[PDB]
Write a protein that binds this ligand. Structure first.
Ligand SMILES: OC[C@H]1O[C@H](O[C@H]2[C@H](O)[C@@H](O)[C@@H](O[C@H]3[C@H](O)[C@@H](O)[C@@H](O[C@H]4[C@H](O)[C@@H](O)[C@@H](O[C@H]5[C@H](O)[C@@H](O)[C@@H](O)O[C@@H]5CO)O[C@@H]4CO)O[C@@H]3CO)O[C@@H]2CO)[C@H](O)[C@@H](O)[C@@H]1O
Ligand SMILES: OC[C@H]1O[C@@H](O)[C@H](O)[C@@H](O)[C@@H]1O
Ligand SMILES: OC[C@H]1O[C@@H](O)[C@H](O)[C@@H](O)[C@@H]1O
Length: 692
């Protein structure tokens, strides 16, 4: 009776038909109910025009869901923090409301003034909270541990940002520049949305990225959380600027041809009771709360309150949050962070995913959370058909990244989160000689090909666990004095620069259907990321980006950046990230050489410390004439210039089409190359005919 298009793609799935039937029934029932009673998902997600503070027909309306409160008032600067004349009334659903008429022809609550939701739980003292739907919240940055104020953000026309540029088209493959605004300046301080837009966005575009993953936008009280512990879900993080400054940022990005994705954190809320959503739990039943209660509401998770995703008002909140970011700020999509935590009641904490599908589909699978994400993905692709929604999920759950209507969760891409640990282990523990070519290839190629992933050698992940950059692992403190272009570099610096290029490149080429690079790592930025904390004396010295290093001409950082720039350009030209054509023809363990085919390019990697292989035979698909497409040993990338960019490499027949016995490394043709130690070279077939 029931068959799902996902079963066609992966046979092992139908073994869990009972689990999927329930999941789909739950999703369809909830959608059906939203459609009948709320006008469908698109209309249901317009919640921010109804909750929080909105201006209508010459009046101001403020709504706040708080079923547990018995009395409620709006307090603020506008009424001198006395709500005796701004008492709200409760409807049958525990939604509090008030209509405040304009005073002197102008809105009763001035733009940029402070407000709080005032309520009492049971005959005692008033409790004052920042509205759940507030759009801006500020704090005195001079004071340590300073509480936030809810700010009514409703600029006059002359101070409302006006979008001047359209959204770029969906790229064939995302080349993502992962970024954090506060730490994006060279100065030891919290940097701004405007500085980022004006000084960093052009760097991103000059490097041929097509997407920015913008982290730490949703308001968070704890700077060192990297945005992961959200307090005010509708508020643009105020330490870096206003909501209008962020609108300027997204628009500037679009003008450079860059798509912008935002980090969406719906896996939890901060447990910060004085500033955030968690202040709305006063001990009621979960049905009248954002969150589960008892163990279910936290599971011993640090700084975390867990959503009851089955709650109607919780769905309205989160789904509207998504529309808010897309509509108001022109984002081109999102990354849902903490998806591993949402998918399972054990949040995958000490798991442990060997590949037994029972680990994915059992009573531990969170249906409430999955239904939410399906509704979210259906919504988002309807609001913006060209949207890209990335899941951050370490578990690698099947059909996470298949269309909702096929029976999947609806995400476009997963992150290949296992990749960096390979390079990290190798760089810490295994001598160059002991590096396995097959083990590298396995890490990169072991993925699901029915779904798309974004590959990266390193990101903000490794930073939050306190790991060192690939560059510093390679070169350490030598980088501070050994990066001069004026004098020849030491063997170990030469070594690091080459491997940095090779690691990034093979990860891009073999790693997946998209690429990601964290701010600074494109040019092998030294040191590491460390937020101001008591243990570093509140120093910003490692909470910044040293742009000077890549900008100064007498240093060698430029060479890694130029290579990163060219690596991305190569992908723009040849489109190999969007190609299913992937063939690893040679994994030479003795010589330390990897050879593979991705798209129309032939890649040769020599990880050997010293040996130059001359006349190295490499398999290829089409016969003809081959030239250097991209070569890491080029002088422009700080190489030795040993490989010739103009030299022809003609092909030899090797058996016949489709007969694996006669073929060379399973390939129907072959050609020869020069391969110096620690180089990576891609090759393309010169088009003949063409001209002439
Ligand atoms: O069908 C007749 C009905 O139609 C209209 O109601 C519809 C609403 O307009 C529509 O929004 C939707 O209702 C949602 C509701 O918006 C949402 O808030 C949620 O309601 C929850 C509350 O969130 C929750 O706090 C709790 O509320 C009460 C509880 O009912 C009561 O038992 C007691 O304990 O106090 C609590 C707090 O004060 O539970 C409710 C109900 O689960 O979910 C609703 C959907 O179930 O759909 C409505 C139906 O179409 C009209 O507005 C209404 O006047 C008509 O009677
Ligand atoms: O919540 C209860 C449901 O959980 C799902 O994970 C299971 O697949 C169903 O069999 C079960 O009825
Ligand atoms: O509890 C809310 C508090 O907000 C603060 O900004 C004010 O100093 C107090 O007047 C008020 O009591």
């Amino acid at each position: 009776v029931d068959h799902l298009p996902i079963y066609d793609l992966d046979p092992k799935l139908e073994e869990f038909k009972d689990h999927f039937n329930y999941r789909i029934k739950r999703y369809l029932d909830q959608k059906c109910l939203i459609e009948k009673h709320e006008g469908g998902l698109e209309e249901f997600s317009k919640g921010y025009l109804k909750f929080g503070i909105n201006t209508v027909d010459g009046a101001t309306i403020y709504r706040e869901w708080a079923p547990a409160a018995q009395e409620a008032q709006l307090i603020g600067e506008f009424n001198n923090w006395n709500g005796a004349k701004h008492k709200m009334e409760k409807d049958k659903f525990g939604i509090w409301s008030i209509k405040i008429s304009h005073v002197n022809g102008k809105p009763a609550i001035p733009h940029n003034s402070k407000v709080k939701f005032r309520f009492r739980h049971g005959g005692g003292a008033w409790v004052d909270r920042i509205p759940a739907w507030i759009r801006y919240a500020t704090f005195d940055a001079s004071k340590f541990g300073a509480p936030y104020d809810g700010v009514h953000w409703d600029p006059p026309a002359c101070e409302r940002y006006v979008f001047k540029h359209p959204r770029p088209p969906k790229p064939d493959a995302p080349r993502i520049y992962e970024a954090h605004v506060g730490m994006s300046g060279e100065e030891p301080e919290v940097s701004t949305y405007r500085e980022f837009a004006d000084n960093v966005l052009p760097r991103i575009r000059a490097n041929n990225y097509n997407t920015v993953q913008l982290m730490a936008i949703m308001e968070h009280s704890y700077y060192a959380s990297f945005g992961y512990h959200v307090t005010n879900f509708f508020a643009v993080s105020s330490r870096s600027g206003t909501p209008e400054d962020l609108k300027y940022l997204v628009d500037k990005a679009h003008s450079l041809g860059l798509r912008v994705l935002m980090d969406v954190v719906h896996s939890h809320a901060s447990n910060n009771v004085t500033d955030g959503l968690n202040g709305y739990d006063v001990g009621q039943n979960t049905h009248e709360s954002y969150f589960h209660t008892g163990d279910r509401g936290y599971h011993k998770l640090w700084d975390s309150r867990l959503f009851n995703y089955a709650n109607w008002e919780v769905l309205r909140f989160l789904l509207s949050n998504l529309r808010y970011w897309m509509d108001e700020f022109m984002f081109d999509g999102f990354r849902f962070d903490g998806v591993t935590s949402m998918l399972y009641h054990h949040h995958g904490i000490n798991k442990g995913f060997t590949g037994n599908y029972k680990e994915y589909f059992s009573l531990d699978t969170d249906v409430d959370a999955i239904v939410y994400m399906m509704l979210a993905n259906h919504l988002m692709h309807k609001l913006l058909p060209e949207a890209t929604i990335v899941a951050q999920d370490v578990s690698g759950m099947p059909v996470l990244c298949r269309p909702v209507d096929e029976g999947g969760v609806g995400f476009d891409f997963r992150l290949a989160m296992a990749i960096p640990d390979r390079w990290i282990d190798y760089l810490k523990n295994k001598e160059d000689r002991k590096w396995s070519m097959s083990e590298i290839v396995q890490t990169l190629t072991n993925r699901r090909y029915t779904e798309k992933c974004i590959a990266y050698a390193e990101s903000h992940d490794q930073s939050i666990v306190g790991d060192k950059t690939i560059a510093f692992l390679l070169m350490d403190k030598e980088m501070y004095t050994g990066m001069s272009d004026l004098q020849p570099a030491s063997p170990t610096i030469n070594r690091g620069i080459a491997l940095q290029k090779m690691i990034h490149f093979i990860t891009m080429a073999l790693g997946g259907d998209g690429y990601l690079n964290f701010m600074g790592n494109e040019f092998g930025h030294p040191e590491w990321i460390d937020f101001p904390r008591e243990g570093n004396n509140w120093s910003y010295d490692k909470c910044r980006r040293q742009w000077s290093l890549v900008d100064t001409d007498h240093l060698r950082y430029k060479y890694m950046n130029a290579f990163d720039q060219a690596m991305n350009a190569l992908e723009e030209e040849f489109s190999f990230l969007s190609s299913s054509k992937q063939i690893v023809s040679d994994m030479n363990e003795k010589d330390k050489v990897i050879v593979f085919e991705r798209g129309d390019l032939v890649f040769v990697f020599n990880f050997h410390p010293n040996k130059t292989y001359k006349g190295y035979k490499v398999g290829c698909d089409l016969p003809g004439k081959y030239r250097v497409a991209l070569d890491s040993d080029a002088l422009v990338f700080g190489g030795h210039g040993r490989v010739g960019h103009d030299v022809d490499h003609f092909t030899s027949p090797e058996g016949m089409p489709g007969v694996p016995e006669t073929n060379f490394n399973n390939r129907p043709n072959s050609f020869k190359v020069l391969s110096p130690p620690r180089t990576c070279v891609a090759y393309y077939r010169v088009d003949e005919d063409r001209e002439e």
